Design an enzyme around this catalytic site. Structure first.
Site, mmCIF file in Angstrom:
data_model
loop_
_atom_site.group_PDB
_atom_site.id
_atom_site.type_symbol
_atom_site.label_atom_id
_atom_site.label_comp_id
_atom_site.label_asym_id
_atom_site.label_seq_id
_atom_site.Cartn_x
_atom_site.Cartn_y
_atom_site.Cartn_z
ATOM 1 C CG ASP A 4 42.625 -46.583 -38.156
ATOM 2 O OD1 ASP A 4 43.882 -46.679 -38.062
ATOM 3 O OD2 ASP A 4 41.820 -47.377 -37.632
ATOM 4 C CD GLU B 250 38.243 -49.985 -38.359
ATOM 5 O OE1 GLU B 250 38.796 -49.791 -37.251
ATOM 6 O OE2 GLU B 250 37.539 -49.133 -38.936
ATOM 7 C CB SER C 186 34.755 -49.136 -41.857
ATOM 8 O OG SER C 186 33.471 -48.923 -42.419
ATOM 9 C CB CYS D 150 38.973 -37.864 -31.288
ATOM 10 S SG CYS D 150 39.386 -36.308 -32.168
ATOM 11 C CG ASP D 151 44.507 -41.275 -32.170
ATOM 12 O OD1 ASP D 151 44.092 -40.874 -31.061
ATOM 13 O OD2 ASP D 151 45.733 -41.511 -32.435
ATOM 14 C CB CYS E 283 41.905 -37.086 -33.632
ATOM 15 S SG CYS E 283 40.125 -36.956 -33.958
HETATM 16 S S1 FES Z 1 41.618 -41.581 -37.279
HETATM 17 FE FE1 FES Z 1 41.393 -40.640 -35.299
HETATM 18 S S2 FES Z 1 39.312 -41.589 -35.140
HETATM 19 FE FE2 FES Z 1 39.470 -42.141 -37.281
#
Ligand code: FES
Ligand code: FES
Lengths: 523, 523
Positions: free
Chosen positions: A91, A412, A438, A132-133, A59
């Site tokens: 994550d 999380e 999550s 997109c993290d 991402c």
């Molecule tokens: S680690 Fe980039 S959105 Fe899940």
């Protein structure tokens, strides 16, 4: 109210003039010539271009390419671009490990990082490029603190080979008017994403001319617009933390009860993973986030008068955009919503007096009661369910010590719900934590319980066997234990030692507010 | 003692195995395949490569090129490289402005940043690439917190078209054994600097095989070696703050009195700007930092048994390197030093009971006495000397409210000394601050005065007209005001309001220790 960053000494270079004009700053002018600026360049606005590129995440690994396009467009708009870059973490990498303790706080570290560079280098505006993290709210918080014209260019979601945190926040930030139309829904590495990058400078130039700043764009009404998109799209409960932190960054107030009121007022309409079937690319193909917001605005659910980074209002942006594609099955009509109100629910009661957050589909029934099964962290819970899964049947599972200070870092957690599903116990127990669960989590799963156990909240006073009764209609997580006996337990309780005594997580412990307060760190 | 970052679950992938081996971490493995890792790659060590590239400073704009070379060498050594990048700021840009309030703290922000990424992604070792700006101690502090094998690759000093903070810290960190030989003295963009980049992976591989960690390299003796290089080279008083912070990061102790003891024991030998004539490139041409350290070790001033990132001791590294070039006039023989002891002086006395730092050349006499002329910040001082320069003649000038909390940010100040010099008042007044004065400062100029004014230290109780007497032989900054009358003033004193209430500087105010404590923020 908010006092954080330097004030400017109308001009388009309100801040950089501090170092480009007086001759007392010749040392500044000499470095600027040294990095490539001509005499005429010194007269131009200076744009800090802050990317979150790093190579250990799909991402984020391509964001330097986007940052180059942004700089090219800044130059093509007659300004000077200065690229810089801050950290981020994955994550998907760290999920299930103590590395997850470092994840949430990186949002606040990114805010500090961008605030620092913009303040020290006297840049006039900001273009931020998060991936997109999950840390992109950090870029908006920095812009709120600085209150210099800024635009967030979402890196884009990867095409398939879900409304998790990244898509939730990107959509919400577009709804809030701090990203250009379609930023949240154009896929990563789509040619239109690069074009958006090359146009951000043109748009920011206009914001400098209007002096349309983040605190002019982020308002109670645009914050509500962001919340409306979260409810309508089924977005992540993490949005509660991040939208509160964004609201605080501009000197506004936003509480858990504001989220309940919007949830009660907005139906869940989007058949999107994790709850539903489709993904963000499918939204892109039927008209993108602007088409979704056009629909919500036509239903009267959004305030169209809010100014946006286009230099026009939300309604002006949406008036022209193609509507949702005829026949699409992703966004339900208001007559047939997936849920009549939003998924996000605030609960209090005996055990969460300062609040808690749940994702309620309306399909799970209104009550659960069971004896408590208490674990002081994720690890002991996973071991117990591995050794003796049947001991979990009918219980209210408590995973505590996972809050902002106790975790530390409010990690999380994903394995507890997977383990419960895998053991066949999904409809047969409930889950409470002062941490977070999550995005696949829903139903009788409650996170963000405040006060956290580390702070002596009632969750830290629960004992095995305590009868816990969760009432979704009354919005209460209650205990059969009398308030007097819980007060007795509170009197005999002492805070556990912190799990760290140095480093960035010890600073987080020293600075972080509760989850109901968005875990802001700078107050 | 130090508890900060995750522990490993011998193997060279002690940390990354946490996520590359277990089947429970399939999601981690999937992202790793997604960023380009093959099955075989999953078995290799994972190296976090943290650069401080940004475009608004000549000392940092080319570090991405160096980072690419470092990654290539990491791969050429059979490992996997993951590049990431954190922020940094330019003092040449921000000097003289409120942007300088954000400068010192970015050191601690960088340490937090690198610690966060290394911890969350489970990397086995680190190669850091700071530029010739001033934040490189932050990279060492991150390595001390993690205690994973690491190497600092200095970006290099720019060739001329000085022993300021960057050269001081680069040389000191090489002397402490955390950079490869010649790292501090090879100029930026020299072909040998790129070669060093391409070799860091080879060296780090060996450190992984020996498990030679930062806390095995940074010890009381190697810290003393670093301090020896500072005294012999005439390095910046900022080295006091940074070497204390580095020592604390590995769980060691380092005090102001330790600096005095080394200063008393080590002569100033290097004819280097600002005090002298030459620059770091001239050192490069006569054999570089290893040649300087070889001489100092031959004089018995250094401990040769300390381990370094070469996997060998300092003496083993220096035994072979070419000695200082025959006939060179830069490094004086021990018989004819520029000063018999070091420039760095610790002073206490009535007005700095917890310490202060000066650069004393031995050419300025032992005493100064004058009535105090007190300013609550740099701006008021600069205004007064502009309107009425003769009112400064004979005074002890006090610029207070410029400490870690009061500034906030303990800004470095350059204009006060320039204004004093320009008014012809250089030998005719003294200068006191709880902040810092730039590297051109020397003589009766005293910084880091503790407690700072914001904390109610005696510096915050001085009134105009108070007779202040500075005695360099006794190492005292004293006042004629009786201790009883200063207690009278302390009893009537109230802390001023903080200048900020939000953002990264408010967090700094909440977290920062005194200058005598190195302004560490994580304790
Ligand atoms: S680690 Fe980039 S959105 Fe899940
Ligand atoms: S700004 Fe980089 S060393 Fe002066």
């Amino acid at each position: 109210s908010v006092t954080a960053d330097p004030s400017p000494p109308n001009k388009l270079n309100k801040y950089s003039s501090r170092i480009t004009e007086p001759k007392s700053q010749g040392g500044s002018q000499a470095i600027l010539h040294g990095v490539g600026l001509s005499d005429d360049d010194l007269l131009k606005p200076q744009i800090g271009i802050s990317s979150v590129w790093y190579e250990g995440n799909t991402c984020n690994m391509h964001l330097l390419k986007l940052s180059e396009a942004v700089k090219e467009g800044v130059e093509n708009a007659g300004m000077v671009g200065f690229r810089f870059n801050t950290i981020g973490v994955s994550d998907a990498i760290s999920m299930g490990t103590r590395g997850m303790c470092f994840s949430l706080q990186s949002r606040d570290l990114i805010a500090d990082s961008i605030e620092t560079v913009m303040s020290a280098q006297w840049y006039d505006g900001n273009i931020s490029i998060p991936g997109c993290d999950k840390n992109m709210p950090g870029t908006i918080m920095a812009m709120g603190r600085l209150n210099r014209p800024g635009i967030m260019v979402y890196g884009g979601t990867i095409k398939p080979g879900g409304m998790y945190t990244a898509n939730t926040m990107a959509s919400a930030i577009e709804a809030m008017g701090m990203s250009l139309p379609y930023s949240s829904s154009i896929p990563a590495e789509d040619p239109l994403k690069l074009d958006e990058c090359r146009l951000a400078g043109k748009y920011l130039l206009e914001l400098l001319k209007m002096d349309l700043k983040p605190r002019d764009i982020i308002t109670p009404k645009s914050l509500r617009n962001a919340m409306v998109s979260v409810m309508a799209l089924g977005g992540s409960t993490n949005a509660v933390l991040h939208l509160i932190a964004i609201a605080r960054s501009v000197g506004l107030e936003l509480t858990l009860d504001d989220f309940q009121k919007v949830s009660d007022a907005v139906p869940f309409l989007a058949d999107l993973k994790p709850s539903g079937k489709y993904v963000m690319e499918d939204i892109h193909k039927i008209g993108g986030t602007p088409a979704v917001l056009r629909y919500l605005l036509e239903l009267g659910l959004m305030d169209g008068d809010c100014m946006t980074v286009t230099g026009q209002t939300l309604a002006q942006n949406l008036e022209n955009v193609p509507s949702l594609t005829e026949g699409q099955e992703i966004i339900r009509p208001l007559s047939n919503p997936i849920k009549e109100t939003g998924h996000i629910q605030i609960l209090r009661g005996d055990l969460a007096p300062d609040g808690s957050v749940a994702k309620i589909t309306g399909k799970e029934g209104l009550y659960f009661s069971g004896p408590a099964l208490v674990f002081e962290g994720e690890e002991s819970m996973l071991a117990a369910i591995s050794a003796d899964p049947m001991s979990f049947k009918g219980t209210v599972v408590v995973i505590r010590g996972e809050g902002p200070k106790g975790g530390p870092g409010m990690p999380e957690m994903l394995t507890p719900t997977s383990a419960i599903m895998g053991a066949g116990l999904g409809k047969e127990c409930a889950l409470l934590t002062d941490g977070r669960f999550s995005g696949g989590s829903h139903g009788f799963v409650f996170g963000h319980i405040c006060p956290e156990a580390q702070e002596g909240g009632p969750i830290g006073l629960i004992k095995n066997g305590d009868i816990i009764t969760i009432d979704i209609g009354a919005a209460r997580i209650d205990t059969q234990v009398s308030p007097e006996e819980m007060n007795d337990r509170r009197k005999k309780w002492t805070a556990p030692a912190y799990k760290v005594n140095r480093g960035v997580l010890y600073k987080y412990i020293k600075n972080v507010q509760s989850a109901s307060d968005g875990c802001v760190t700078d107050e």
